[PDB]
Amino acid sequence: PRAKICVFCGSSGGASPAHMEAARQLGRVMAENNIDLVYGGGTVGLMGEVARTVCSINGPESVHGIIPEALVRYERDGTYQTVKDNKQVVPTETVYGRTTVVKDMHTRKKMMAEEVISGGPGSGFIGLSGGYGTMEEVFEVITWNQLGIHTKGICLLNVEGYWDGILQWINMAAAQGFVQPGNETIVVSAGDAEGAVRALREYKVSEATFKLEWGRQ
Amino acid sequence: PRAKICVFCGSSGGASPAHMEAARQLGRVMAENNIDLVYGGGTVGLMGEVARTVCSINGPESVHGIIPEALVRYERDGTYQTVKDNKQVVPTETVYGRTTVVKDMHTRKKMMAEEVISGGPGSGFIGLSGGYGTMEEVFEVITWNQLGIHTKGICLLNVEGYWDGILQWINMAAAQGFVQPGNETIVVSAGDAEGAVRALREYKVSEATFKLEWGRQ
Ligand SMILES: O=P(O)(O)OC[C@H]1O[C@@H](O)[C@H](O)[C@@H]1O
Numbered sequence: 001p002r003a004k005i006c007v008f009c010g011s012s013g014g015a016s017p018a019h020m021e022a023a024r025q026l027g028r029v030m031a032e033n034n035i036d037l038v039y040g041g042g043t044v045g046l047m048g049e050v051a052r053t054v055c056s057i058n059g060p061e062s063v064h065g066i067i068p069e070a071l072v073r074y075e076r077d078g079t080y081q082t083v084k085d086n087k088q089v090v091p092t093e094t095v096y097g098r099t100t101v102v103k104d105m106h107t108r109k110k111m112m113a114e115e116v117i118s119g120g121p122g123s124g125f126i127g128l129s130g131g132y133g134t135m136e137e138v139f140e141v142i143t144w145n146q147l148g149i150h151t152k153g154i155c156l157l158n159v160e161g162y163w164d165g166i167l168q169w170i171n172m173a174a175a176q177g178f179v180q181p182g183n184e185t186i187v188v189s190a191g192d193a194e195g196a197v198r199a200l201r202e203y204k205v206s207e208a209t210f211k212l213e214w215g216r217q
Numbered sequence: 218p219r220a221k222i223c224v225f226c227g228s229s230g231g232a233s234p235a236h237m238e239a240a241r242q243l244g245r246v247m248a249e250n251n252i253d254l255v256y257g258g259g260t261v262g263l264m265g266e267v268a269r270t271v272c273s274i275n276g277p278e279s280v281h282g283i284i285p286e287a288l289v290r291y292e293r294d295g296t297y298q299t300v301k302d303n304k305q306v307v308p309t310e311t312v313y314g315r316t317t318v319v320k321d322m323h324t325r326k327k328m329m330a331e332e333v334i335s336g337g338p339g340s341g342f343i344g345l346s347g348g349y350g351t352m353e354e355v356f357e358v359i360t361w362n363q364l365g366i367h368t369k370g371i372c373l374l375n376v377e378g379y380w381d382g383i384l385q386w387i388n389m390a391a392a393q394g395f396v397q398p399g400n401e402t403i404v405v406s407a408g409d410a411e412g413a414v415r416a417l418r419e420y421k422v423s424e425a426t427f428k429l430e431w432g433r434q
């Protein structure tokens with residue numbers, strides 16, 4: 001079973017080019033380690049960038065985008081050149097990998113989650129630069145890890161201190177005890193693609209609990 | 218139709234007592250303005266505190282907690298003294314208001330959301346101090362406002378700069394353009410209960426879009 005990484009990132013490119021560049025780099029690194037890509041479909045923004053790179057290196061089979069019905073096209077144009085049997089028009093499979101269309105956002109998130117959880121070793125979630133959506137997804141899979149629904153790691157790829165505020169809040173929450181001891185390590189951060197992939201590889205859920213309650217066992 | 222406020226906050230009390238005190242104050246303020254409370258049920262932490270206060274001032278009818286089946290008790294003890302017809306044991310209704318038990322977390326969030334959306338004027342969501350759950354909920358209803366699923370405001374109640382990191386990240390995201398112009402005002406913040414309630418009252422979704430595209434219309 002190959003390793004799969006779900007990369008939550010923005011639908012927009014971002015002001016500083018370092019975000020797009022980070023998308024490209026993460027793409028290359030994931031592609032070299034034979035890591036298959038799970039992302040929320042589309043051809044725009046950091047998502048489309050990572051998809052484009054990973055697919056460009058390891059072919060369509062290495063990328064699986066999952067798009068809600070509402071974001072589906074019904075005409076062929078530009079980056080959307082591959083048609084489904086139900087006449088749905090979807091991102092060009094040879095450039096952005098395979099694309100599965102689902103009815104709802106809920107089943108979408110659930111499906112990406114599933115595809116990551118069932119993935120091989122080193123599987124996990126990476127949070128690249130994005131807005132409210134990517135954040136919501138990140139904290140969602142965080143909550144799911146917290147509920148013992150999965151055992152995969154979650155790593156924020158910090159481009160020029162973009163996630164600094166969030167790490168800061170995590171610190172504040174662990175300090176005030178709202179994030180219980182042992183849960184602070186659910187999320188890690190990295191400054192580069194290799195760091196993020198390594199983070200997902202070396203992650204073990206029971207690590208923090210081991211540290212906190214082994215001298216206590 | 219009365220005004221309903223959903224207050225997302227931690228299941229733990231927090232280190233600094235200012236959090237608990239803030240729960241109490243928000244409770245009092247909401248109760249005085251005849252604002253009915255929607256919260257995720259339970260008797261523990263800031264949630265239980267706000268519930269306890271609001272209910273103590275305006276009776277059980279003013280508080281509606283919504284609890285997943287998994288957090289339900291089946292024996293009577295302490296703060297859980299009221300039994301349902303299906304023998305489920307639930308928070309004492311006279312102290313923590315009414316409690317509706319639902320099967321799943323999804324339908325739970327959906328239901329709280331529904332109860333807020335259908336509420337009167339001044340209805341909205343308040344994010345008091347909490348961990349990964351409250352954050353996930355906040356960014357969730359943010360995403361929903363962003364998707365035009367509701368028109369209610371979202372306000373973070375900032376106790377001693379607890380939400381500072383998050384506001385900071387929002388600033389960074391709006392700066393890098395990941396939070397599109399006009400969406401930065403989806404979430405506001407306040408230093409006190411009155412400020413939060415006033416924020417929810419005076420909120421209008423179309424405010425920012427009005428500002429950005431009226432000289433452009
Ligand atoms: O930049 P944001 O809005 O945070 O994320 C954009 C994408 O992130 C996905 O989850 C959404 O369903 C949307 O397609």
Ligand SMILES: O=P(O)(O)OC[C@H]1O[C@@H](O)[C@H](O)[C@@H]1O
Nearest residue numbers: 227228257347348349350351
């Ligand atoms: O302190 P956190 O974990 O963020 O929030 C605790 C509560 O927040 C609710 O949404 C949960 O379902 C949980 O009952």
